[PDB]
Design a protein around this ligand. Sequence first.
Ligand code: 7UM
Ligand code: 7UM
Lengths: 114, 114
Amino acid sequence: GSHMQDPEQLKHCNGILKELLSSKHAAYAWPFYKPVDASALGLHDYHDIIKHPMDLSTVKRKMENRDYRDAQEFAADVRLMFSNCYKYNPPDHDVVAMARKLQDVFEFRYAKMP
Amino acid sequence: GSHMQDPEQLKHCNGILKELLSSKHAAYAWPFYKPVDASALGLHDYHDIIKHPMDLSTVKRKMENRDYRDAQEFAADVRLMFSNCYKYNPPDHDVVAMARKLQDVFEFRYAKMP
Ligand SMILES: CCCn1cnc2c1c(=O)[nH]c(=O)n2C
Ligand SMILES: CCCn1cnc2c1c(=O)[nH]c(=O)n2C
Protein backbone atom coordinates (compact mmCIF):
# COMPACT_ATOMS: atom_id res chain seq x y z
CA GLY A 1 0.00 0.00 0.00
CA SER A 2 1.25 3.45 -0.93
CA HIS A 3 2.39 5.76 1.86
CA MET A 4 2.42 9.55 1.74
CA GLN A 5 6.22 9.44 2.16
CA ASP A 6 6.73 7.38 -1.02
CA PRO A 7 7.06 10.37 -3.42
CA GLU A 8 9.74 12.06 -1.30
CA GLN A 9 11.58 8.77 -0.74
CA LEU A 10 11.51 8.12 -4.49
CA LYS A 11 13.01 11.60 -5.01
CA HIS A 12 15.90 10.59 -2.75
CA CYS A 13 16.27 7.40 -4.81
CA ASN A 14 16.30 9.44 -8.01
CA GLY A 15 19.00 11.65 -6.50
CA ILE A 16 21.12 8.58 -5.72
CA LEU A 17 20.60 7.28 -9.27
CA LYS A 18 21.69 10.62 -10.72
CA GLU A 19 24.80 10.49 -8.53
CA LEU A 20 25.61 6.92 -9.64
CA LEU A 21 25.45 8.09 -13.28
CA SER A 22 27.46 11.28 -12.67
CA SER A 23 31.02 12.08 -13.72
CA LYS A 24 32.15 11.93 -10.08
CA HIS A 25 31.83 8.12 -10.12
CA ALA A 26 32.41 7.39 -13.82
CA ALA A 27 35.81 5.73 -13.28
CA TYR A 28 34.09 2.74 -11.61
CA ALA A 29 30.41 3.13 -12.59
CA TRP A 30 30.87 2.68 -16.34
CA PRO A 31 30.40 -1.15 -16.48
CA PHE A 32 26.91 -0.65 -15.02
CA TYR A 33 25.63 2.07 -17.36
CA LYS A 34 23.99 -0.24 -19.92
CA PRO A 35 22.76 -3.85 -20.11
CA VAL A 36 25.55 -6.41 -20.31
CA ASP A 37 25.98 -7.23 -24.00
CA ALA A 38 27.01 -10.83 -23.38
CA SER A 39 27.60 -11.73 -27.03
CA ALA A 40 29.70 -8.62 -27.71
CA LEU A 41 31.84 -9.33 -24.62
CA GLY A 42 32.26 -13.04 -25.38
CA LEU A 43 30.39 -13.97 -22.19
CA HIS A 44 28.36 -16.72 -23.81
CA ASP A 45 27.29 -18.22 -20.47
CA TYR A 46 26.09 -14.92 -18.98
CA HIS A 47 22.36 -15.51 -19.52
CA ASP A 48 22.59 -19.09 -18.26
CA ILE A 49 24.05 -17.83 -14.96
CA ILE A 50 22.20 -14.49 -14.64
CA LYS A 51 18.44 -15.02 -14.76
CA HIS A 52 17.48 -11.38 -14.08
CA PRO A 53 19.85 -8.88 -15.73
CA MET A 54 19.82 -5.33 -14.37
CA ASP A 55 21.76 -2.12 -15.06
CA LEU A 56 21.54 1.61 -14.36
CA SER A 57 19.88 2.51 -17.68
CA THR A 58 17.08 0.07 -16.89
CA VAL A 59 16.73 1.47 -13.35
CA LYS A 60 16.55 4.96 -14.89
CA ARG A 61 13.84 3.95 -17.37
CA LYS A 62 11.83 2.33 -14.56
CA MET A 63 12.16 5.49 -12.46
CA GLU A 64 11.18 7.74 -15.38
CA ASN A 65 8.15 5.56 -16.20
CA ARG A 66 6.99 5.52 -12.54
CA ASP A 67 7.49 1.74 -12.42
CA TYR A 68 8.97 1.80 -8.91
CA ARG A 69 6.24 2.40 -6.36
CA ASP A 70 8.54 2.77 -3.35
CA ALA A 71 12.17 3.04 -2.32
CA GLN A 72 12.49 -0.63 -1.38
CA GLU A 73 11.56 -1.70 -4.92
CA PHE A 74 14.20 0.64 -6.37
CA ALA A 75 16.86 -0.59 -3.93
CA ALA A 76 16.14 -4.24 -4.75
CA ASP A 77 16.90 -3.56 -8.44
CA VAL A 78 20.14 -1.67 -7.74
CA ARG A 79 21.24 -4.48 -5.42
CA LEU A 80 20.24 -7.09 -8.02
CA MET A 81 22.59 -5.37 -10.49
CA PHE A 82 25.51 -5.63 -8.05
CA SER A 83 24.62 -9.21 -7.07
CA ASN A 84 24.69 -10.28 -10.73
CA CYS A 85 28.27 -8.92 -10.95
CA TYR A 86 29.31 -10.83 -7.76
CA LYS A 87 27.62 -14.03 -9.05
CA TYR A 88 29.08 -14.07 -12.59
CA ASN A 89 32.64 -12.75 -12.17
CA PRO A 90 35.53 -14.07 -10.07
CA PRO A 91 35.86 -12.03 -6.87
CA ASP A 92 39.30 -10.67 -7.84
CA HIS A 93 38.10 -9.31 -11.22
CA ASP A 94 38.46 -5.57 -11.73
CA VAL A 95 34.75 -5.30 -12.54
CA VAL A 96 33.99 -6.68 -9.06
CA ALA A 97 36.29 -4.08 -7.48
CA MET A 98 34.38 -1.39 -9.39
CA ALA A 99 31.02 -2.86 -8.31
CA ARG A 100 32.07 -2.83 -4.64
CA LYS A 101 33.04 0.84 -4.81
CA LEU A 102 29.82 1.86 -6.59
CA GLN A 103 27.75 -0.21 -4.17
CA ASP A 104 29.44 1.60 -1.28
CA VAL A 105 28.33 4.90 -2.83
CA PHE A 106 24.82 3.50 -3.14
CA GLU A 107 24.46 1.92 0.30
CA PHE A 108 25.82 4.83 2.29
CA ARG A 109 23.55 7.34 0.57
CA TYR A 110 20.52 5.02 0.58
CA ALA A 111 21.01 4.76 4.34
CA LYS A 112 20.53 8.57 4.54
CA MET A 113 16.92 8.22 3.33
CA PRO A 114 14.94 11.23 4.72
CA GLY B 1 2.93 -15.82 -4.78
CA SER B 2 4.97 -18.75 -3.53
CA HIS B 3 7.25 -20.53 -5.99
CA MET B 4 8.41 -24.14 -5.76
CA GLN B 5 12.00 -22.87 -5.45
CA ASP B 6 11.26 -20.84 -2.30
CA PRO B 7 12.02 -23.66 0.21
CA GLU B 8 15.43 -24.40 -1.32
CA GLN B 9 16.27 -20.70 -1.62
CA LEU B 10 15.31 -20.21 2.03
CA LYS B 11 17.66 -23.09 2.92
CA HIS B 12 20.48 -21.18 1.21
CA CYS B 13 19.47 -18.09 3.21
CA ASN B 14 19.52 -20.13 6.42
CA GLY B 15 22.99 -21.37 5.51
CA ILE B 16 24.18 -17.78 5.06
CA LEU B 17 22.65 -16.80 8.41
CA LYS B 18 24.40 -19.70 10.13
CA GLU B 19 27.67 -18.57 8.56
CA LEU B 20 27.15 -14.96 9.69
CA LEU B 21 26.67 -16.23 13.27
CA SER B 22 29.63 -18.64 13.15
CA SER B 23 33.00 -18.36 14.87
CA LYS B 24 34.69 -17.77 11.50
CA HIS B 25 33.24 -14.24 11.37
CA ALA B 26 32.86 -13.47 15.09
CA ALA B 27 35.64 -10.85 15.15
CA TYR B 28 33.45 -8.47 13.10
CA ALA B 29 29.94 -9.98 13.38
CA TRP B 30 29.53 -9.53 17.14
CA PRO B 31 27.91 -6.02 17.08
CA PHE B 32 25.07 -7.51 15.00
CA TYR B 33 24.25 -10.56 17.14
CA LYS B 34 21.54 -8.93 19.28
CA PRO B 35 19.27 -5.86 19.12
CA VAL B 36 21.06 -2.59 19.77
CA ASP B 37 20.53 -1.78 23.45
CA ALA B 38 20.52 1.97 22.93
CA SER B 39 20.12 2.90 26.60
CA ALA B 40 22.89 0.55 27.74
CA LEU B 41 25.25 1.97 25.10
CA GLY B 42 24.38 5.61 25.81
CA LEU B 43 22.95 6.02 22.30
CA HIS B 44 19.92 7.98 23.43
CA ASP B 45 19.09 9.19 19.91
CA TYR B 46 19.25 5.72 18.32
CA HIS B 47 15.48 5.14 18.13
CA ASP B 48 14.85 8.66 16.83
CA ILE B 49 17.22 7.99 13.90
CA ILE B 50 16.56 4.26 13.34
CA LYS B 51 12.86 3.64 12.73
CA HIS B 52 13.19 -0.11 11.99
CA PRO B 53 15.85 -1.82 14.13
CA MET B 54 17.15 -5.18 12.90
CA ASP B 55 19.80 -7.67 14.03
CA LEU B 56 20.86 -11.26 13.41
CA SER B 57 18.95 -12.73 16.38
CA THR B 58 15.75 -11.22 15.01
CA VAL B 59 16.51 -12.56 11.52
CA LYS B 60 17.10 -15.98 13.10
CA ARG B 61 13.80 -15.91 14.99
CA LYS B 62 11.96 -14.90 11.81
CA MET B 63 13.62 -17.74 9.89
CA GLU B 64 12.84 -20.27 12.65
CA ASN B 65 9.19 -19.13 12.82
CA ARG B 66 8.78 -19.33 9.01
CA ASP B 67 8.13 -15.58 8.87
CA TYR B 68 10.19 -15.08 5.71
CA ARG B 69 8.29 -16.41 2.71
CA ASP B 70 11.12 -15.97 0.19
CA ALA B 71 14.79 -15.11 -0.13
CA GLN B 72 14.16 -11.49 -1.09
CA GLU B 73 12.30 -10.85 2.17
CA PHE B 74 15.20 -12.33 4.16
CA ALA B 75 17.77 -10.28 2.23
CA ALA B 76 15.85 -7.04 2.79
CA ASP B 77 16.07 -7.57 6.58
CA VAL B 78 19.80 -8.37 6.55
CA ARG B 79 20.41 -5.30 4.40
CA LEU B 80 18.21 -3.19 6.69
CA MET B 81 20.46 -4.18 9.60
CA PHE B 82 23.57 -2.98 7.75
CA SER B 83 21.84 0.18 6.51
CA ASN B 84 20.89 1.12 10.09
CA CYS B 85 24.60 0.90 11.02
CA TYR B 86 25.60 3.12 8.03
CA LYS B 87 22.82 5.62 8.88
CA TYR B 88 23.50 6.00 12.63
CA ASN B 89 27.30 5.83 12.93
CA PRO B 90 30.00 8.02 11.36
CA PRO B 91 31.53 6.27 8.34
CA ASP B 92 34.97 5.99 9.99
CA HIS B 93 33.63 4.24 13.12
CA ASP B 94 34.99 0.76 13.79
CA VAL B 95 31.45 -0.64 13.90
CA VAL B 96 30.98 0.55 10.30
CA ALA B 97 34.21 -1.19 9.26
CA MET B 98 32.89 -4.38 10.85
CA ALA B 99 29.50 -3.97 9.12
CA ARG B 100 31.18 -3.57 5.72
CA LYS B 101 33.17 -6.78 6.17
CA LEU B 102 30.13 -8.77 7.34
CA GLN B 103 28.03 -7.36 4.52
CA ASP B 104 30.69 -8.49 2.05
CA VAL B 105 30.36 -12.02 3.46
CA PHE B 106 26.60 -11.75 3.07
CA GLU B 107 26.43 -10.25 -0.43
CA PHE B 108 28.96 -12.55 -2.04
CA ARG B 109 27.27 -15.68 -0.70
CA TYR B 110 23.73 -14.39 -1.35
CA ALA B 111 24.82 -13.88 -4.96
CA LYS B 112 25.56 -17.65 -5.13
CA MET B 113 21.86 -18.45 -4.63
CA PRO B 114 21.18 -21.86 -6.28
C1 7UM C 1 35.43 -5.22 -17.82
C2 7UM C 1 35.26 -6.54 -18.55
C3 7UM C 1 34.07 -6.52 -19.50
N1 7UM C 1 32.80 -6.22 -18.81
C4 7UM C 1 32.05 -5.10 -18.99
N2 7UM C 1 30.98 -5.08 -18.22
C5 7UM C 1 31.06 -6.24 -17.51
C6 7UM C 1 32.16 -6.97 -17.85
C7 7UM C 1 32.46 -8.23 -17.25
O1 7UM C 1 33.42 -8.97 -17.48
N3 7UM C 1 31.51 -8.60 -16.31
C8 7UM C 1 30.39 -7.89 -15.93
O2 7UM C 1 29.63 -8.32 -15.07
N4 7UM C 1 30.17 -6.67 -16.55
C9 7UM C 1 29.11 -5.79 -16.05
C1 7UM D 1 31.12 -0.67 19.21
C2 7UM D 1 30.43 0.52 19.86
C3 7UM D 1 29.15 0.11 20.57
N1 7UM D 1 28.18 -0.54 19.67
C4 7UM D 1 27.78 -1.83 19.73
N2 7UM D 1 26.93 -2.16 18.77
C5 7UM D 1 26.79 -1.01 18.06
C6 7UM D 1 27.53 0.01 18.58
C7 7UM D 1 27.54 1.33 18.01
O1 7UM D 1 28.18 2.31 18.39
N3 7UM D 1 26.72 1.41 16.90
C8 7UM D 1 25.96 0.41 16.33
O2 7UM D 1 25.28 0.62 15.34
N4 7UM D 1 26.01 -0.83 16.94
C9 7UM D 1 25.38 -1.98 16.27
